[PDB]
Design a protein around this ligand. Structure first.
Ligand code: NAP
Ligand code: MTX
Ligand code: CA
Ligand code: CA
Length: 159
């Protein structure tokens, strides 16, 4: 299946000036745990903010232009992106804004981190209805030494 994984703040803010504006180690671990051994799909701007392939995962980058780095697999369309992922149980779509928008109607699961931080973004997660998504897991955690904000993990399954 196709799954989306994303950290959101207030107003579903996901990013600002090509970066993510918070400090949350608990989220990185959760991300690593749910994506390791999976193919990961991302847009070119998200690729350019990471710059090294996500190790232990097949890396597929969407771009309308020819690839500029042979450590990763480049694809020119959403259908080419899914085909390059081959026959796996779960393909992870990991950002950014424009990529989430395109894959959201094809997705069966969402893994979300709701971070209780009020920041300004120039990129937002698509608007999603509970009419379509059932919550099968959610945990809330208070801020601590490593994590400056409270945050909750949730897994939703399409209805
Ligand atoms: N909060 C999170 O969990 C999270 C996760 C990841 C990223 N982010 C943030 O999201 C922001 C980047 O988001 P973004 O929406 O600007 O960019 P993005 O979605 O990462 O990348 C957009 C680019 O991807 C390519 N692309 C997307 N769809 C394509 C398609 N269907 N066919 C061909 N190319 C396609 C295009 O590249 P060309 O111009 O080369 O054609 C497009 O300009 C950053 O601030 C990043 O930090 C947040
Ligand atoms: C820019 N970016 C995208 C990113 C970050 N956190 C996310 N968190 C969630 N929940 N969802 C995402 N899509 C997501 N995406 C990043 C930034 C750093 C690393 C990163 O290097 N993660 C390490 C974890 C260990 C470390 O950060 O040093 C890894 O190897 O997976 C990955 C993606
Ligand atoms: Ca580097
Ligand atoms: Ca059902």
């Amino acid at each position: 299946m196709i799954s989306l994984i994303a950290a959101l703040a207030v107003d579903r803010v996901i990013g600002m000036e090509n970066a993510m504006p918070w400090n949350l180690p608990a989220d990185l671990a959760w991300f690593k745990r749910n994506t390791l051994n999976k193919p990961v799909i991302m847009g070119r701007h998200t690729w350019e903010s990471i710059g090294r392939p996500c190790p232990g995962r097949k890396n597929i980058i969407l771009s309308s232009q020819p690839g500029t780095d042979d450590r990763v697999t480049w694809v020119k369309s959403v259908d080419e992106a899914i085909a390059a992922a081959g026959d796996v149980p779960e393909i992870m779509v990991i950002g950014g804004g424009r990529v989430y928008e395109q894959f959201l109607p094809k997705a069966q699961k969402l893994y979300l981190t709701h971070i209780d931080a009020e920041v300004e973004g120039d990129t937002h997660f698509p608007d999603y209805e509970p009419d379509d998504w059932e919550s099968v897991f959610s945990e809330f955690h208070d801020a601590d030494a490593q994590n400056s904000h409270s945050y909750s993990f949730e897994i939703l399954e399409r209805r």
